[PDB]
Amino acid sequence: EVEMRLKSIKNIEKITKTMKIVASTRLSKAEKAKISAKKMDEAEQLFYKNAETKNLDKELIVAITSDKGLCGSIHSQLAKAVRRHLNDQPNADIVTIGDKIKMQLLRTHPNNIKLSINGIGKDAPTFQESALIADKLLSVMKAGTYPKISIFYNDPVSSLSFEPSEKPIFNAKTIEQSPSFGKFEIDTDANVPRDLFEYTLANQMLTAMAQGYAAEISARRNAMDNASKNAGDMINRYSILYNRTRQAVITNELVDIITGA
Amino acid sequence: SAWRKAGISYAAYLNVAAQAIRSSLKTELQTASVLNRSQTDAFYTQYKNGTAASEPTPI
Amino acid sequence: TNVISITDGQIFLEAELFYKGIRPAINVGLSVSRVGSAAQVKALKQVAGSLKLFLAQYREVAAFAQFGSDLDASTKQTLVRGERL
Amino acid sequence: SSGLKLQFALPHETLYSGSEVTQVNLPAKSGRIGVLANHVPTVEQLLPGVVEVMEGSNSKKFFISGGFATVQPDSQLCVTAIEAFPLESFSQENIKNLLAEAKKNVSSSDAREAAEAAIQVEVLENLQSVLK
Amino acid sequence: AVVGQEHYDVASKVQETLQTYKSLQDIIAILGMDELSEQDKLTVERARKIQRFLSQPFAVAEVFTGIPGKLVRLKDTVASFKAVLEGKYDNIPEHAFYMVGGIEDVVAKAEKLAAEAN
Amino acid sequence: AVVGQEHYDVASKVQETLQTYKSLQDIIAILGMDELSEQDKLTVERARKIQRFLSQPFAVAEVFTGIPGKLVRLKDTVASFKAVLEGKYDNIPEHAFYMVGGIEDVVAKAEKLAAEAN
Numbered sequence: 041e042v043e044m045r046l047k048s049i050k051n052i053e054k055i056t057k058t059m060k061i062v063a064s065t066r067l068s069k070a071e072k073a074k075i076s077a078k079k080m081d082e083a084e085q086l087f088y089k090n091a092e093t094k095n096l097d098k099e100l101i102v103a104i105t106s107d108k109g110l111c112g113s114i115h116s117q118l119a120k121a122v123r124r125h126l127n128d129q130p131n132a133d134i135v136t137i138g139d140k141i142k143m144q145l146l147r148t149h150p151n152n153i154k155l156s157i158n159g160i161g162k163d164a165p166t167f168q169e170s171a172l173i174a175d176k177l178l179s180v181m182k183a184g185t186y187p188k189i190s191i192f193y194n195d196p197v198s199s200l201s202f203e204p205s206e207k208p209i210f211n212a213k214t215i216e217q218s219p220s221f222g223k224f225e226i227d228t229d230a231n232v233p234r235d236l237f238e239y240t241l242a243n244q245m246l247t248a249m250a251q252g253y254a255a256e257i258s259a260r261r262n263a264m265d266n267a268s269k270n271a272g273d274m275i276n277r278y279s280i281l282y283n284r285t286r287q288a289v290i291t292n293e294l295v296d297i298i299t300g301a
Numbered sequence: 302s303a304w305r306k307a308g309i310s311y312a313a314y315l316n317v318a319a320q321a322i323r324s325s326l327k328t329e330l331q332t333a334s335v336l337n338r339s340q341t342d343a344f345y346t347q348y349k350n351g352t353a354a355s356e357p358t359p360i
Numbered sequence: 361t362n363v364i365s366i367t368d369g370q371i372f373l374e375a376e377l378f379y380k381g382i383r384p385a386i387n388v389g390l391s392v393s394r395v396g397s398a399a400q401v402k403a404l405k406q407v408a409g410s411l412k413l414f415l416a417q418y419r420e421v422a423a424f425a426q427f428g429s430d431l432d433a434s435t436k437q438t439l440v441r442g443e444r445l
Numbered sequence: 446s447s448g449l450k451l452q453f454a455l456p457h458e459t460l461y462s463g464s465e466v467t468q469v470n471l472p473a474k475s476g477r478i479g480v481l482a483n484h485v486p487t488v489e490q491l492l493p494g495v496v497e498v499m500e501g502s503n504s505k506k507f508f509i510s511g512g513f514a515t516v517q518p519d520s521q522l523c524v525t526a527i528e529a530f531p532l533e534s535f536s537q538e539n540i541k542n543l544l545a546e547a548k549k550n551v552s553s554s555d556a557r558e559a560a561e562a563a564i565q566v567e568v569l570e571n572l573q574s575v576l577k
Numbered sequence: 578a579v580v581g582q583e584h585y586d587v588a589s590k591v592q593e594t595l596q597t598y599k600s601l602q603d604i605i606a607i608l609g610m611d612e613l614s615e616q617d618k619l620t621v622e623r624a625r626k627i628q629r630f631l632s633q634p635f636a637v638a639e640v641f642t643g644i645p646g647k648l649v650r651l652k653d654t655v656a657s658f659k660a661v662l663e664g665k666y667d668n669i670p671e672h673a674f675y676m677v678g679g680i681e682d683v684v685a686k687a688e689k690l691a692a693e694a695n
Numbered sequence: 696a697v698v699g700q701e702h703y704d705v706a707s708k709v710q711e712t713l714q715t716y717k718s719l720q721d722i723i724a725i726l727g728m729d730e731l732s733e734q735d736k737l738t739v740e741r742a743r744k745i746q747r748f749l750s751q752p753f754a755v756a757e758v759f760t761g762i763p764g765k766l767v768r769l770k771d772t773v774a775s776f777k778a779v780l781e782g783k784y785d786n787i788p789e790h791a792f793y794m795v796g797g798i799e800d801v802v803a804k805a806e807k808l809a810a811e812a813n
Binding site: 396398420424431432433434435 | 724725726727728758759
């Protein structure tokens with residue numbers, strides 16, 4: 041049964057290599073998106089720094105996960121934050137994004153998930169797909185009326201130094217009357233506050249989804265990488281056992297044949 | 302333009318503008334990600350209190 | 361070894377198959393028959409010509425489903441076809 | 446910092462990042478935003494027009510179909526547009542005349558669909574207008 | 578036709594599940610329980626519970642396990658296993674499935690673990 | 696200098712394309728037949744037909760298969776595989792060059808089979 045173990049580990053290693061190639065293919069696009077998305081969000085963040093855009097105070101619960109079903113700690117860490125939010129704010133509506141986050145959000149509170157959209161992590165973060173997702177969110181159940189909304193989003197530092205970290209969003213009320221919003225002026229006719237809330241949600245969502253897709257592609261290159269290491273170690277051990285077993289079998293055969301003679 | 306009355310949101314308007322502006326261009330400008338910008342496979346099925354994901358209509 | 365070198369072939373009923381519930385337990389991939397369908401009623405042959413290839417494909421997707429993850433349309437269809445067969 | 450910095454980083458592909466300029470005149474929602482230098486703390490949602498970003502060199506003209514240009518107190522114009530455009534690829538004739546009219550077929554849809562597509566009704570005219 | 582069609586099916590399902598666990602053990606160790614299917618994960622969890630249900634307290638083995646021995650009734654055991662595969666106690670504790678009698682003693686052990694472990 | 700200058704040129708590609716076809720054997724089944732580039736998808740559409748075209752019915756395997764046998768020559772097969780690589784018949788169907796004779800014999804296989812579709 042050692043031979044079947046070695047060959048099955050070898051097959052798992054081949055499958056892991058194929059998954060690594062798929063990870064590279066998806067990670068190229070995820071990084072390509074995140075590169076521009078980070079700057080896009082920093083553009084409106086400059087305003088949120090130009091005007092201290094602290095939001096005070098029906099409050100949604102969100103998470104970051106692409107269209108894959110967990111990779112090491114890609115879905116688990118976000119699920120823990122989702123359960124913590126469910127405990128803290130049971131009456132908090134959930135935005136079920138992708139599949140793994142969709143399944144995790146459907147797990148805790150049936151009355152929280154207000155949307156169930158799948159396959160968000162199809163490819164790189166696209167501006168139009170993210171924008172349409174937000175516009176639907178900005179139209180579903182008055183998520184703009186949601187006084188506060190925390191984005192429990194991945195913060196991949198370099199490779200996997202992340203969890204679904206929580207951040208605030210400057211909404212329609214919190215944009216116009218920010219304490220340092222006196223710095224940047226708005227127009228009564230232009231209706232700045234609503235548009236600033238929507239666009240802040242847009243930039244934050246695009247940047248966060250791009251970072252999360254990049255981080256899960258990392259989980260497809262930093263969790264399967266650990267699995268590839270495990271397969272290498274198991275394969276070396278099994279190869280040692282089989283090479284020793286074959287040699288010992290041949291030796292015992294020679295010994296038996298001579299001992300017969 | 303008519304985002305004020307009966308659209309979806311500011312993102313919907315600017316995204317439709319993006320789709321038209323890309324349509325106001327040939328292949329020598331529109332990169333591959335513009336295809337996913339046009340081919341959006343995000344399937345929106347708003348759930349419910351009783352976990353009623355009605356229909357995953359493309360976003 | 362000598363029998364498998366002299367016999368017609370084998371139905372190498374591996375223990376995993378019989379443990380996997382498939383009773384009888386002809387491990388189709390590990391099976392072999394030198395004679396083959398030429399020594400068969402063609403009524404069987406018309407369906408076996410596809411049955412063998414379907415089992416072969418299922419052998420090609422066994423590892424992919426062993427990973428327990430998604431894939432393209434051909435792969436998932438092959439897995440469902442092989443398990444059903 | 447002297448001059449005026451622009452942050453034109455759209456959700457598609459970031460174009461400008463804090464580069465100095467002499468003018469970034471753009472078509473705001475309430476009007477024409479001709480912020481040349483420094484500007485003042487005020488950020489406006491934008492209307493489809495031309496952003497002739499006058500750098501220290503010539504003013505590149507790109508008919509941009511939307512955005513918001515945050516005039517940060519550091520003479521930083523954070524123009525988080527939705528689309529990018531060249532000074533040459535954003536200039537064409539046939540692509541700006543038939544596409545909108547073919548889209549007018551979509552306007553034959555129901556009420557909410559027409560309300561959405563009313564933006565596209567005049568979307569392509571702006572590029573052919575600002576192409577010069 | 579020996580011990581019952583239901584018994585034969587129960588044994589067949591149990592063996593299939595355990596064989597699935599052994600077959601997936603390689604990928605489980607190499608990658609982890611999360612990396613595979615939720616159907617596969619569910620089967621693996623049920624199989625682990627079943628394997629942990631395989632042991633029992635034997636009357637003279639009380640020297641080792643320390644529990645007074647338990648003799649599981651054949652029909653009761655078959656029903657218990659059919660239930661456990663069918664998820665009539667799939668939420669009971671794993672450590673409360675080892676060294677007990679039938680699924681009744683399993684539930685009693687789960688309650689005891691609810692009292693002590695908490 | 697021992698097998699023919701062209702025969703090594705084509706085989707080098709033929710070995711590489713099949714190895715690339717072997718290299719593309721894993722990737723195509725993972726995410727689909729899309730990831731290939733224009734040269735790669737050409738190879739996937741040149742080799743997976745050539746690897747299928749690798750087959751040939753035998754002049755002695757008459758009793759089982761039923762397809763009359765094929766016996767092209769070296770000057771036939773060598774330039775045959777190159778034209779398959781060269782794409783001069785890249786429009787041939789999936790089974791067009793498979794289980795066939797030479798390159799000139801891969802033309803009729805699709806042509807006679809295309810009669811059923813029209």
